[PDB]
């Protein structure tokens, strides 16, 4: 009946931010003032909450999405952004309540000649919609020629890997994010607090 | 995968004058990332480089097969061909792959000006006989 | 896929009285759309067909092969099969595919029997030796 | 803010209508009749609703359905139909308040060796309900022997690929098709007009 | 599948002191429950267990290739692969593919002291020569 | 129109238990009599419901899973209970309100060289949530070395097959397994009685 936040903190694997992980965390009793100890976070913004004002109110859903990213993409997970992680991975929507929760994962996800296994989306014929997925890999059109299928000059396979090195510098460091969705919608009540 | 790894198929005892479709698999990332190139050694001779191909999918070829070789990029697969015509009983070797990972501040420099790659396969020997 | 492409493989070196499976892998459309023929072409002599499958399953032999090999389907993979069987030195051969589009009106309708397809392989030689 | 319908209205491939596509109109200000202006569409039909009264009806859900069937297929797209479309790959509910918009795509879709990249559904075991979607590609049983996963006789492959040409008559031409489904559930409303 | 199957594929004519990686892939069940060995065949000599895996992935080689042969296990692919490594002439044979199924009661137990196996495979080519 | 039950008992194939199927019965009127009378079941416990009152209820929805497993893990199919299957394939909720009905199928799922086709989950990392559906295929890792994406000692591949041969003892032999869930929304009824 424990709220189990150690699973999406402690994993030995993140998901890839083009295939992002959504966790729903329902009927659960949980303590949240307990993780703010944790002041090794680089990053950590509430959006229409402070971030110990949560005690008492309560809201029906709470999500945990998470995935990695590189330093310099961070600062693009919040509402309103662009760059190919706001627009062609994750997107927040304008009007989000919830946080928006990183830390630097260079001693975990990165190995010395480099770890490609973490991918990203670097091309897309339209912005996604907020929490939209997009997990197809088809040919993107980059010129005028059509692609029809096949890879060649300006017809491009749309994901890349990041490569992930210990002696790379912070804006290509591994960074682990994790973002909780907290919805005004209407139904019973599944997640408490401290 | 921690690694990467490179497995090349295809190899076969062909003809004179036959073709040949060689393929580097790959598994640790995405191969779409990577430069990747195609070598060959002969029995008793060095290896030498015949065609590779960018991550802007632009390809280039040594003279001795310019006009028979195609490399080719199957990213739904994590591959790369190596279309062989025209098979002359002087191809016989063995075909080898090989990459190395372009960070994005690189995206448009090309390719066997990157003779040096990271990351090899063992190859799969072609015989060209009668 | 723009157009129906056909690549086979698992050609060796075999050995008298060895067996062997050849595949015909299929992009740019459904393979059980399409009936599907192999061929095979000797040193020196003229294409022949070997073996047939339409789109109802059915399978027709030439009587030099016929007991020894078969045609299959796996389109959950999108290819077809060759199971070949017994083989003697004189079926060292390059084995081909092809393919053509069976449209409402006719899917029940034989193989081997028109014997034109519209989409090749390049092959897969096949050589049986001591 | 606006919605343009044109990212429902412009791919350059379509879906197969056994995998069919759905794209929601999350929250969107609309203008519908500059879009009925385009008489060169071969089928406008709507159902449940008036045709030209589409400015002042303000709906709750906005679904845009799309896939590729070919032109003697179109007459199946209805509520109430039969035939493999309707009963195997789409099938409308009977209380189906939408209107069903079809057009002829020969230049867009056809290849001269013939087009074999859509593909549709010819067998099921049973019809599908409204609104289902079917990916499955399980070996159908239309015999007495149980196929058991293998491919043989009376035991075929459930989906087919159309050949599409240029020179194929209109009955064998590929139409792309959009279903606008117009629900009133309660929710937040998302489509309204101008 | 109703049954199990496995088929060998990457026999190839290589060279001595060449390197392949044969493999084994299943139909029919997981191949993750199974024992899992190779076998080889040299020209008119008898079968001959070379190497095995069992389902907790220990491995157990024959005293002539201890060394030179990997087995390992991509169940992901439902395959067993074989790298085999500084080959030389003797090693010329058919290698086959062969398996049995390990219930929940047996899970910790060795392998090549089972060499009865229930399921093969047709066995796939290797030529080493100069 | 009617409640397609006959459906979903009289398959041909059934789902692995680790990819376990679910399909919605709604919008049907359904018969309830002819199933219960019907008592070859080697199993039909039902929680939360009279299994004799299913002709006066009305449900909103009513959700049919079904899958196989091996005959003493039918003990598993219960609210609360422990094992790989509970744990680890499917695990129902305490508050959970219908039925599980089982009965062996050795005759259909059996064959003479063993039956290898049905799958479980052996290993996890953590007991699925009720109603969790777990199909990823990631190494486990079983020691302190991290498995990194090789599978080797102490790295096992997820999967196992049932042997289902004729053979086997009953706790052995494969039995297939419906659970009807019986949804109690406040939305209108769509699944009621005769």
Known sequence: ?194 | GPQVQLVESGGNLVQPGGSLRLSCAASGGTLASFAVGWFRQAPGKEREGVSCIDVINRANYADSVKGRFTISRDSAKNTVYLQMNSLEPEDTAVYSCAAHFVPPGSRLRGCLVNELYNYWGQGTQVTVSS
Chains 1, 4, 6 share one sequence.
């Open chain 1, 1 to 194: 009946n424990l709220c189990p936040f150690g699973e999406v903190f402690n994993a030995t694997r993140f998901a890839s931010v083009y295939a992002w992980n959504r966790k729903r965390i329902s009927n659960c009793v949980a303590d949240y003032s307990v993780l703010y100890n944790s002041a090794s976070f680089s990053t950590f913004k509430c959006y229409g909450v402070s971030p110990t004002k949560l005690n008492d109110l309560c809201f029906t859903n709470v999500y945990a999405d998470s995935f990695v990213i590189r330093g310099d993409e961070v600062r693009q997970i919040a509402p309103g952004q662009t760059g190919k992680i706001a627009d062609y991975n994750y997107k927040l929507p304008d009007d989000f309540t919830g946080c928006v929760i990183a830390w630097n994962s260079n001693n975990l996800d990165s190995k010395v000649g480099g770890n490609y296994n973490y991918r990203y989306r670097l091309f897309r014929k339209s912005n996604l919609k907020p929490f939209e997925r997009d997990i197809s890999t088809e040919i993107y059109q980059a010129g005028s020629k059509p692609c029809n299928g096949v890879e060649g000059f300006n017809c491009y396979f749309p994901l890349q890997s990041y490569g992930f090195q210990p002696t790379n510098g912070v804006g290509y460091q591994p960074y682990r994010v994790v973002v909780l969705s907290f919805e005004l919608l209407h139904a019973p009540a599944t997640v408490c607090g401290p």
